[PDB]
Structures are given as structure tokens and as C-alpha cells.
Design a protein around this nucleic acid. Structure first.
Ligand code: MG
Ligand code: MG
Lengths: 57, 75, 104, 189, 68, 57, 144, 143, 145, 55
RNA sequence: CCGAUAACGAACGAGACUCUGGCAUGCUAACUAGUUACGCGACCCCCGAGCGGUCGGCGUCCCCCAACUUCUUAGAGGGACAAGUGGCGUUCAGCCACCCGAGAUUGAGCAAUAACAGGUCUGUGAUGCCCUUAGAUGUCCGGGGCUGCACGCGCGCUACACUGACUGGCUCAGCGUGUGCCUACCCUACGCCGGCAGGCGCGGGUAACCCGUUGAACCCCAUUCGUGAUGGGGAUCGGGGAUUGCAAUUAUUCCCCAUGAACGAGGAAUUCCCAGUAAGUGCGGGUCAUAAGCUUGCGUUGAUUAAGUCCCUGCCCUUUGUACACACCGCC
């Protein structure tokens, strides 16, 4: 999960973007679930401009 | 101060009191006469407009809730 | 022929709606057709208020989704025939058109 | 001149103390035909002074739940009551109002957070603006309480409340609580 | 109260005032029209907050040596 | 007329069709790098565009 | 003698209540909803509607004929709309047809007595939020 | 000095026309007037014995203002407030046979007739009477 | 004329097996009779053609017995069939109206009728619970503690 | 059972007559505007349908 | 944010942003919106008015057979920025008052890093693991139950009355919905019958076209009542009648006639709230074959007090002490 997220994050930044954030949540490593987040570049979170400045999946 | 037991209908001892001393002071209303002569208050509204027809009492307001009368002018 | 057509455009976004209204009436001026002005009907706003939580536990928060629908009426009334003169729609996705004769 | 309620010219009334001359609005600038105006009197501090006091009494006379928006009824009760006090005193109803307002507003009170003997701890004299506000509220509560379960109506009960307040006979609920507040303040000096 | 200007409005004013000192005066309405063609400001509410500060800084630069 | 449906329910059903089609194209073309769907609809006939990264599959 | 096209239409609004006053050169005649001004439902508040004619005199209304229509609002918001409409129609009539010296000396009286007769009250309403029964009041909360 | 019903007091006008219908005994009055309630949302029968003449006077005043009102529109004009006891209050329309019969009797008195569309309006004779009664009540009020 | 009280004034009358106060209105005094409501009172006096504005006690005795026999015989004096109490009797189907303690023993008779067949309503009347199906989770506790 | 009783009991109305077009559930149905969609599924597909959060 | 500054350059959040309200007699338009003007009517006048007054009566896109966008609708634009003055402020950041101004603080949406063993496996063809899987924990069908009552608690509705209730008349709103893929179940003008709930036929509306000028409530104006558990209150309960559904009993809902219970402003405590706000007051939507005391929005009437404080309950920044780190509901 750590290596795959780095490859996807680098692929997005290489194709041209202001920033990118990927969050993977679930039963990683041990039994108890964890959420690993990898963020780089610029990333707004509030207001109207988030509707047309980011793509969320 | 338990119950008013006011006068639904007149008697002679109070009717004359209505006829002689009620149209003598400045502010006469059905509430004032009801508490003063211990009459009911429905009898007060009827008797006040009876004195209006007799002409010895002048009306000023004529409202559904607050109808106000007065004594005649002296002087 | 003698023709008279009522044209209505119903969409959701004002951006494309003002664009489709402007260029359709702009071509008619080059075609010297008599055109009534854009009749901006009152907006139909679809309002739905649904609880935000999918379970029913929390601080009683609600979500209010508003859908805006805008309608314009444009009359193409030339003294002569009209249908063969304007057979081009030149429309974009997001706006719905409807052609109505004067009889209908 | 403005003929409030159609009569009762406001140019003959006067305030007999300068501490309240500038906070009562019976003057010609605030002389109004009717005590009814939505002039946004709660937008800013120190704006209820320029609000006419006849309107202020009308505002404070609607309370106790059943009467929280009804201003047409309150204006008609004030209209009845002012005519009644004119019929019972023979002077301007506004002069009766100014006499009642001054004679009802308590001039001292007490308020603390620490240990209190009877009600409060330390005596503090009140402001002229609080004098008027407490005066109107005390008059409205006195009229309402007397009229709650008796055959006398609101216009009459408000009339005798302001009349007994204008003279001063320890029968007005406004002056009764005023004397109680002054005595408590004197003890808490 | 509650009328402090943020970094975006302040820095934009400081950038455009000293570059366009010849094109600016002390009028809010005049300067707000200057900022439209020399600065692509997406929001009208932003541009008249900037221009209101532009006149304020111009009133000080007419007297003393502002940091700009 | 009564044969036609009201505009209020028609635009709702258009959103129903777009969401249903988007979900179906997601499920069927998940491994195909499906990106999104655009609808160009005219009264004569409608047209569906499948925005995808790898069209040869 | 029969000069036409002397008409000014001025409206005033208060609390969703709109009223439009049609002023024309004619004899003394004031009517709203086709009814006389005095023949109106709120007899208690009739003095509010008689305030504009009282503050300016009937001479200013002699050569003025006003026909007002009300198409929305409430009972007293109808009153506050009309009383602003009549004065606004009068000052606009003096503004366009005679010199504004007469307009100034009639406008200064209304603005000093009650500015609501010239400037409408901007406040309309507020929206109820989903935390309580009112716009700002919240539902009664309990802890035990 | 022409006088319109729109130019007089409506409460005085409705009282004047009610006595006018009372003295001229042509109004068709049914047999259950003293028993029924005027509205489903009103608990008690009205105090006045001549309430039918009151309804006819009121609806003739309303038909002058606007026409085309049938049974459904009339009962909404006369609708009011229903307390429902312990439940919160609601709006309930009045009786339908009351409004229908009041209008029905007005055809017998020849002052209200139906339209080409639904609802009914005033006859020219009714428009004559409804303004004539306005004239006498305006002069009586003035002097 | 708001005159003095009539000499032949009964301060409290006695109709059937109940008394009625004469110091109130006539249409609101006969409501004190069990079985007579305000609506029933306000139509029987209309059909008896008696003055409403007079109080109950000043009614003449011949008027009083007239009112009693009108209310006791409603079916024969233009009183509508939708205005009675025991309309379509469970015993004999006739449309009667009862205004005395006979109403109480008709209530008792219907009670023991429900109990004898022991219907669901009959059994719950025996236990003193509700009968109209409302909830008993939290309400009605005043009569129990 | 056989053909006469497998689905015999009427379901022409009520909650049991209506099921969600997405999650096939008989609770929280938003039948307004002919949606017939789940309470939670509507929140999921609101953006794609056209409903947006304006206030 | 200004200023100092071992930091400089930044990033998110806040702001900015979007929607909403308030001014635009400025622009574009409007027979699915109307206003003026004109011509027919209809009535009141007539002493005579005569351009008298009124009509939601009819006409002038029944396309040559009026104009106009003020009212209404909705797009493009403007307008408000601490902009001007005075004082205060390091005279910087900004603050206070005021003139002119529609507005000198309109309400919301969105909303950071990190976290909780907070809630949902009863939202899902989201799902791991375990269990059942034919006498099924699958599924269908019939009935009952989820309503059940010595009791406690929570959210609310109704009232305790005369600032009221009853009766009659008068007279003004704005959100929004309305005939269905499956899926059967629309919103209703008008006429007639009945007292009511209701019923029967004509219609209209897939809707600024019809409902609908949404003739709402409150309130206002008159009547009766008259300080009593009364004409306040309608709880409980009997009988009768309709509607929806296949099914109404444990009463679905509604109507009518019957009874008239507590309740006379409620202890300790406790909730919410600052301007179109509380409160009064009704109306739409969701639920719905039947339906609101729920909730979500809308409208009418409209205030009192306050422009402050950290006293109580808490929150943030700095300093400080700590034997706390599952973090004071700690440790001991
Ligand atoms: Mg923000
Ligand atoms: Mg009684």
C-alpha cells in the first residue's frame, strides 16, 4: 500500500497538477484498521472554489 | 373573598341607588358599577344603556370591549 | 404560408441558457424575422431537505439540495413561412427545446 | 399640536426634573399622531430614548404569552385608558403619564454576586435610562396583575394604576415596589 | 470592528500602487476603475476592497515615505 | 399534453438516467480505466460518450 | 385646459406589502383599492394614513388625484406601504412637473417626521433553521 | 354625488340590506334554519334569528366585489378557525348547503344569475339595488 | 327595561329530577340537566318560541312545562333525527332522547350488555382501563397513584 | 406454494408496495418528484442527478 | 493585520468564495405578468355635473386590432469600499461617532492537521470472519405483536381565562405541490342532493396558462357572557352516520347529538434567545390508499431588556507546577 500510493501520487504530479492527496483506510497491517494519508502540493478544502478545483473519487 | 354572588336582577334597594347616585361621578363603566353596587355586570351593561336612552348619561367610546360613559356636565 | 412558432427553452444552468437564447435570436436578425423578447418565466426550484446522517445518530443535521430550473419563451413570428427558414437547432447539452405551432 | 389620538396637545406637558427631561420623548420632535411606529428602535444602544414614550408603554403592555404581537389591541387599550384618566383627572393624559413615570422609577437598587444578607449586598444608584425602563415595566405589571382575575378591564386597571402613581398613595404596584427597592438599597448601603 | 485587511488585499494593493503610481489618484471610484484593466481580479467584492486600501495608502504616500 | 410529463419530473428523471448510466459504466468498465460519461441528447435521438483512458479495450 | 399625460406612478413597500400610487392632475380625490381613504378596515390605525395629508395640508392635494392599489402583504404592512406610497408619489409629482424648490420644502417635512415615508424599511424576514422551531430559537434540550 | 357600496361602511351596508331582505318577504328560507350550524368548525348556532338574511346580505356584498364564486369559493370566504379541542387549530370551511341555498334563493329574488362559465354574478337589477342601498346608508351616515 | 326581579321568580327551579339555576340564562340553565347540551338547549327554545334574552328564573311555569314536554317528545316537534342521543337504539331501534337519570341507567344497561357478551370493549370496562384504544404506557396514572 | 398463493396477498399500496430503485429497501423512500430513491442513496447520487448544495 | 524579529520562503484553515435579502422609475424583455390610455357595456347619480364615481364586466396577439415595464417575473450590469469629516491610535495597523447613503455587522452553504475502540453490518448486488441453509435464521401465506399498564423520565400540544370565550360582519400573505416505467395511489374550479362528514356529472390543469386575485389564521369591528372550575377547558365515555382499504375490533380518519375530569399560573431545578429576533398565529412539503400533536420551510402581528462580564458553566493564547500520559472520571 505504501509503494502503490507513491507511484499513483507521483503519476498525478508528473501529469501536471497543483497538488494531490490520497487517503487509504482499512485493515492495514494488524487487525485494527488504520488510515494512511499522503498529501503534496496545494490543496484547498473550503468554500465554493472546491467544487471546480478538485476532483474527488 | 370567596365568591361574588352578585345581583343578576335588580331589587328596589339597589335600583334606586342606580337612579340617584350612579350618574353623579366622572367615570361610569359597566365594570365600575358592577363592583360598586355588587350587581352582576350583564345587568350593568343593560342598565347603563337604559340611562343612555333616558339621556342623563353621556357615552364617549362605544367599544365592544371598553364602553365608557360619564355624568352630564354641571355648570 | 402564414406561420407563428412559440419556442421554449428549459435548462438548469443560466450560463448555457443565456448562450442558447442569445445566438438563436441573433441568427433571426440576420434572417430578418420578427422576434418577441425573451420571456423569463419564474424559476422552478426543487427543494429537498434530507437528514445528513445515514443512521439517525448525531446532532440532527439536515442537508438541503436545491435544483434550479429556468425557462425562456421566444416567439419567431415572420409574416411568411418560418419552418424552412430555420431548420437548424444548434443546441448544446443541458438545455431542452420544444417547438410549438401557433395552433398548439 | 400633533393631537395624539386626535386630541391631547403635547405642548403643555412638562418634565419636573432635568434628569429625565432628556430621556422622555413627550417633546415636539417626538410628538406623534399615534403610538405605533416600526422605527427600528433596537438597532443600536441609546436609541430607545428618541422612541416616543407613549409608544414605549404600548410596547411594554403586551406580555404574558397570549399578547406578544398584538399591537392594535394594545393601542386601543391605551386609547381607552388615556381618555379615561382625562375623564377622571381633568388634565392632559400625557401629564399624568409623565407624573407616573417619574414617580414609579426607583432611584436606587442593589446587585452583587458575593454573600447577601437579605436580597443583595451593595447599594448602587440607578441610571435615568434604567429609571424609565423599570418605571414602564412596573406600571404594566401592576395593571396586568390587578386586572388578571377581576371584572375591571385592562383600560380601567391601567388607568387607576397610573392615576395612583401620579399622586402617590402606596396603592400603585409601581410605587410599592419602588419603595421596597429603596428600603432594601438603604439597608444594603 | 472586524474590518482588518487580509494578506491578499493588502499585498495586491502594495504591488499595484508603486508600479502604477502615475495611473492612480486618491478617489475610490477612479482607482477602482484603474485596477480592472491592470489587475485581473476575479471578484468585484475583492477589487473594491483593494481600491479602498489603494486610496488609503495614496493619502499617506502624498505626505511621507511609506514602506511601499 | 397529458402524454408528456411535467418538466419538474422530467429533469429529475434525466438526472436518474445520468446517474444510472454513470454507475453502470463504472461497474462494467472498472478495469478499463473508465473516467466519466457525457450525454449529448436531442429529441431526434440521444448520444452517449464514454470518457475513458484506454479505449482499445 | 385639457392637458393630458401628466401622470406619475410611484410605489412604496414594507414587509412584503407592495402598494403603487397613480398620481394625476385632478381635483381632490384619494382612493385606494377603489375605496375612500377613510373607509378602510383599520379604524384604529386610520390616523397613520391621515398623517401624510395632515403634515402637508389639503392645498398640496387639491390639484392631485391619487389611485392606489395593494396586491400583497398583511394588514398593517398594507398601511405602512400606502402611507409611504402617497408621499413618494407626491414628491415625485413635484419633482418632475414643477420646480424642485416646492419638492424640497415638502420633502424636508416628511423626512424629519418619519423617514419611513420616503425610505422603505429594508428588513423583510429571516429563515427558520433546522435546530429549532424558529429562525433563532432552538429546541429544548435535556441531559437526563 | 353618486354613491357606491365601495364608498360606504361594509358593516353598516350589510346590516341595512339584511333588514331590507327581512321586510320584503321574498327570500326563500328552508326549514332547518333554526337548527343547523352555519359552519362545521363553529360550535354553536348564531344568536340572531334572522341569520339567513345576514348571509344573503353578506354574499350579495361579496358578489358585487367579484363574481364567479360557486359553493366552494363561497364556503372559503366564510371559512374560519377550528379549535379541534386538544389538537392544534386548523382552517375549516363553512357549510355547503347553507351557501348553496342562499345563492339559490337569490335567483328567486332575481338579483343573481349564473355565468357562461362556472359560478354566478349579479343581474343589472341587483347592481341597481346594491348601489341604491349604498346611497341611503351614505346619506344616513352623513346626516 | 332592566327592571327589578319578578315576584314569581324561582331562584332555583326543579325540572324532572334536577335543579336549574335561575340566575343564569335560560339556554344555559337547562344544560345542567343531564343529557342536555348547549346545542340541544339552543334549538328547543327556538321551537318553543320563547325569548332567549330573559333569564331562566323569570320563565313562567306554563312555559317551563311546555319546554319540558317538547324536550321529552323530540320526534313529534320537527326536531331532526340526527339531533338525538339514543338514535337507533340497541334494544328496540327507535330514535329516543333521554334527559334524566334514565340516561345513567341506559349507560349502565349498555355497560352490562357489553360485559355479558364480554366483548373487548366490555372486558376493558370491567377492568377500568381505556376502551377507545389509546395508549396506556404513560397516561391515566392520576387515578392510580 | 403454487401459483394461487405465492404472491396472492395484495401489495397495491403502502410501504410494502414501494421499494427503492437502488438499494431495494422499503424505508426512507423519497417519492417526491418521482424519485423513488433511498434516503441514503439520494445523498450518494445527488451530485450526478443535478441536485446541489446551495445553502 | 501592523510592527519587532535566527529566521526566510511558504501551505491549509479564517478570510476570500457560492447562494440568499435589501436600492436601483438605469438596460433587455414579456397574451402563461400586469399598469395606464381609449372604446363598448352595467349601476349610482341627475339639481347637471360627465374627463363624476365604481366594476377581476368586455375589448384593443380574436397580429395590424393601443402604448409601457412603475407594480410582477429574470438576465445582463451597477451600487458599499472604513469611501468622506472629526476625535483616538506608535499616527502605522485600525477603532469610535456622524453627514450623505437602500444597506456602514442580512442570513446560510462550504469549512484545516489530528482524533473517538462515538453511531450505523436494520441503506445497499459495501464487506471480512462466524452462524443457518430444507422441520431454513431463505421466502410466501393467515393471525397476533411492535399500541400491551401499580411506576419514573424526555420532546411537545392543549388550557388554567374577561389583553378572554361565543356569534355575525369586515379584511390583507408567501414558500411550495399537483395525473405515476415498474406502480395500482393526482391537484381540483362549477352545478345539483344532504344539516354535516359526504355523494353524483360536467370540466380544467403535466401547470406565471387550471386549482388560484391561493378571499389562511391571527387581528379588526359589533353581540352575548360576567370573576363561579361559568358560555373557561375538552380529558374520559355512550349512541348514530360516511369516507380510504381486501380487512377499521385493540376504536384508521372525519362528522353529529350526548358526559363535562383535572387544571385557578405550577417546588427543587432547568431550556432557548438580541431585530423583522422571542412569542402569538395559521399555510405548504416529507411521511400518506387513510392521515400530523412530529419535522422541514413559508407568511402575518411584533416587542421588553442588553452593546457588558468572567461570578457560574465552559473555550483560546502565554507563563507556571506536576509523582498525570488509559492524561484529574489521573495518580495515590
Ligand atoms: Mg470560508
Ligand atoms: Mg351554559
Amino acid at each position: 500500500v505504501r509503494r502503490a500510493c507513491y507511484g499513483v501520487l507521483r503519476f498525478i504530479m508528473e501529469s501536471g497538477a497543483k497538488g494531490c492527496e490520497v487517503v487509504v483506510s482499512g485493515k492495514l497491517r494488524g487487525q485494527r484498521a488504520k488510515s494512511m494519508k499522503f498529501v503534496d502540493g496545494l490543496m484547498i478544502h473550503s468554500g465554493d472554489p472546491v467544487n471546480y478545483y478538485v476532483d474527488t473519487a | 373573598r370567596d365568591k361574588l354572588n352578585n345581583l343578576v336582577l335588580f331589587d328596589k334597594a339597589t335600583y334606586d341607588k342606580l337612579c340617584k347616585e350612579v350618574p353623579n361621578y366622572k367615570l361610569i363603566t359597566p365594570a365600575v358599577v358592577s363592583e360598586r353596587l355588587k350587581i352582576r355586570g350583564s345587568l350593568a351593561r343593560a342598565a347603563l344603556q337604559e340611562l343612555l336612552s333616558k339621556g342623563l348619561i353621556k357615552l364617549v367610546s362605544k367599544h365592544r370591549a371598553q364602553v365608557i360613559y360619564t355624568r352630564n356636565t354641571k355648570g | 404560408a402564414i406561420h407563428r412558432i412559440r419556442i421554449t427553452l428549459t435548462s438548469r444552468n443560466v450560463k448555457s441558457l443565456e448562450k442558447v437564447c442569445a445566438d438563436l435570436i441573433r441568427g433571426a436578425k440576420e434572417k430578418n424575422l420578427k422576434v418577441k423578447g425573451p420571456v423569463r418565466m419564474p424559476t422552478k426550484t426543487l427543494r429537498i431537505t434530507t437528514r445528513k446522517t445515514p443512521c439517525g445518530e448525531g446532532s440532527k443535521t439536515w442537508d438541503r439540495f436545491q435544483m434550479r430550473i429556468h425557462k425562456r419563451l421566444i416567439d419567431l413570428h415572420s409574416p411568411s413561412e418560418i419552418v424552412k427558414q430555420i431548420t437548424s437547432i444548434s443546441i448544446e447539452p443541458g438545455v431542452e427545446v420544444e417547438v410549438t405551432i401557433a395552433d398548439a | 399640536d400633533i393631537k395624539l389620538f386626535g386630541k391631547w396637545s403635547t405642548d403643555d406637558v412638562q418634565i419636573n426634573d432635568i434628569s429625565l427631561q432628556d430621556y422622555i420623548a413627550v417633546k415636539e420632535k417626538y410628538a406623534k399622531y399615534l403610538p405605533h411606529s416600526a422605527g427600528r428602535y433596537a438597532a443600536k444602544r441609546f436609541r430607545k430614548a428618541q422612541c416616543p414614550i407613549v409608544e414605549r408603554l404600548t410596547n411594554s403592555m403586551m406580555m404574558h404569552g397570549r399578547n406578544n404581537g398584538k399591537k392594535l389591541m394594545t393601542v386601543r387599550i391605551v386609547k381607552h385608558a388615556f381618555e379615561i384618566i382625562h375623564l377622571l383627572t381633568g388634565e392632559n393624559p400625557l401629564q399624568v403619564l409623565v407624573n407616573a413615570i417619574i414617580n414609579s422609577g426607583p432611584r436606587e437598587d442593589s446587585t452583587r454576586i458575593g454573600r447577601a444578607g437579605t436580597v443583595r449586598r451593595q447599594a448602587v444608584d440607578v441610571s435615568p435610562l434604567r429609571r424609565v425602563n423599570q418605571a414602564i415595566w412596573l406600571l404594566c405589571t401592576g395593571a396586568r396583575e390587578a386586572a388578571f382575575r377581576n371584572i375591571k378591564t385592562i383600560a380601567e386597571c391601567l388607568a387607576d394604576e397610573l392615576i395612583n402613581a401620579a399622586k402617590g398613595s402606596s396603592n400603585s404596584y409601581a410605587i410599592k415596589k419602588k419603595d421596597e427597592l429603596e428600603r432594601v438599597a438603604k439597608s444594603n448601603r | 470592528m472586524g474590518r482588518v485587511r487580509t494578506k491578499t488585499v493588502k499585498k495586491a494593493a502594495r504591488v499595484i500602487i508603486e508600479k502604477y503610481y502615475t495611473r492612480l489618484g486618491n478617489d475610490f471610484h477612479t482607482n477602482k476603475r484603474v485596477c480592472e484593466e491592470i489587475a485581473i481580479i476575479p471578484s468585484k467584492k475583492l477589487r473594491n476592497k483593494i481600491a479602498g486600501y489603494v486610496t488609503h495608502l495614496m493619502k499617506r504616500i502624498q505626505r511621507g515615505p511609506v514602506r511601499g | 399534453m397529458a402524454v408528456q410529463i411535467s418538466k419538474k419530473r422530467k429533469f429529475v428523471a434525466d438526472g436518474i438516467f445520468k446517474a444510472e448510466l454513470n454507475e453502470f459504466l463504472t461497474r462494467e468498465l472498472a478495469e478499463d480505466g473508465y473516467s466519466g460519461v457525457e450525454v449529448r441528447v436531442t429529441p431526434t435521438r440521444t448520444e452517449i460518450i464514454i470518457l475513458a483512458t484506454r479505449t482499445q479495450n | 385646459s385639457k392637458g393630458p399625460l401628466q401622470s406619475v406612478q410611484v410605489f412604496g413597500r414594507k414587509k412584503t406589502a407592495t402598494a403603487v400610487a397613480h398620481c394625476k392632475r385632478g381635483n381632490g380625490l384619494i382612493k385606494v383599492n377603489g375605496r375612500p381613504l377613510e373607509m378602510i378596515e383599520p379604524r384604529t390605525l386610520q390616523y397613520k394614513l391621515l398623517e401624510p395629508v395632515l403634515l402637508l395640508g389639503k392645498e398640496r392635494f387639491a390639484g392631485v388625484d391619487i389611485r392606489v392599489r395593494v396586491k400583497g402583504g398583511g394588514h398593517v404592512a398594507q398601511i405602512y406601504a400606502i402611507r409611504q406610497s402617497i408621499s413618494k408619489a407626491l414628491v415625485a409629482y413635484y419633482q418632475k412637473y414643477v420646480d424642485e424648490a416646492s419638492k424640497k420644502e415638502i420633502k424636508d417635512i416628511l423626512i424629519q417626521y418619519d423617514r419611513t415615508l420616503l425610505v422603505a424599511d429594508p428588513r423583510r424576514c429571516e429563515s427558520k433553521k433546522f435546530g429549532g422551531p424558529g429562525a433563532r430559537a432552538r429546541y429544548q434540550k435535556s441531559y437526563r | 354625488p353618486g354613491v357606491t357600496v365601495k364608498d360606504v361602511n361594509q358593516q353598516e351596508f350589510v346590516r341595512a340590506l339584511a333588514a331590507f331582505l327581512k321586510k320584503s318577504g321574498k327570500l326563500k328560507v328552508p326549514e332547518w334554519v333554526d337548527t343547523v350550524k352555519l359552519a362545521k368548525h363553529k360550535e354553536l348556532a348564531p344568536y340572531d334569528e334572522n341569520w339567513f338574511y345576514t348571509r344573503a346580505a353578506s354574499t350579495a356584498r361579496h358578489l358585487y366585489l367579484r363574481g364567479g364564486a360557486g359553493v366552494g369559493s363561497m364556503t372559503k370566504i366564510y371559512g374560519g378557525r377550528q379549535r379541534n379541542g386538544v389538537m392544534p387549530s386548523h382552517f375549516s370551511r363553512g357549510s355547503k348547503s347553507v351557501a348553496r341555498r342562499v345563492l339559490q334563493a337569490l335567483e328567486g329574488l332575481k338579483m343573481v344569475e349564473k355565468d357562461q362559465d362556472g359560478g354566478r354574478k349579479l343581474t343589472p337589477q341587483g347592481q341597481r339595488d346594491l348601489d341604491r342601498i349604498a346611497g341611503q346608508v351614505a346619506a344616513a351616515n352623513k346626516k | 327595561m332592566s327592571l327589578v326581579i319578578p315576584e314569581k321568580f324561582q331562584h332555583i327551579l326543579r325540572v324532572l329530577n334536577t335543579n336549574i339555576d335561575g340566575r343564569r340564562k335560560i339556554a344555559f340553565a337547562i344544560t345542567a340537566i343531564k343529557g342536555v347540551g348547549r346545542r340541544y338547549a339552543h334549538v328547543v327554545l327556538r321551537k318553543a318560541d320563547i325569548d332567549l334574552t330573559k333569564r331562566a328564573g323569570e320563565l313562567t311555569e306554563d312555559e317551563v312545562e311546555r319546554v319540558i314536554t317538547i324536550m321529552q317528545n323530540p320526534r313529534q316537534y320537527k326536531i331532526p333525527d340526527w339531533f338525538l342521543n339514543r338514535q337507533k337504539d340497541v334494544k328496540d331501534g327507535k330514535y329516543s332522547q333521554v334527559l334524566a337519570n334514565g340516561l345513567d341507567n341506559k349507560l349502565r344497561e349498555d355497560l352490562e350488555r357489553l360485559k355479558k357478551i364480554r366483548a373487548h370493549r366490555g372486558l376493558r370496562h370491567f377492568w377500568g382501563l381505556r376502551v377507545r384504544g389509546q395508549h396506556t404506557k404513560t397516561t391515566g396514572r392520576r387515578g392510580r397513584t | 406454494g403454487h401459483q394461487q398463493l405465492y404472491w396472492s396477498h395484495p401489495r397495491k399500496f403502502g410501504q410494502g408496495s414501494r421499494s427503492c430503485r437502488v438499494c431495494s429497501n422499503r424505508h426512507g423512500l423519497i417519492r417526491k418528484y418521482g424519485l423513488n430513491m433511498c434516503r441514503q442513496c439520494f445523498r450518494q447520487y445527488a451530485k450526478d442527478i443535478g441536485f446541489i448544495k446551495l445553502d
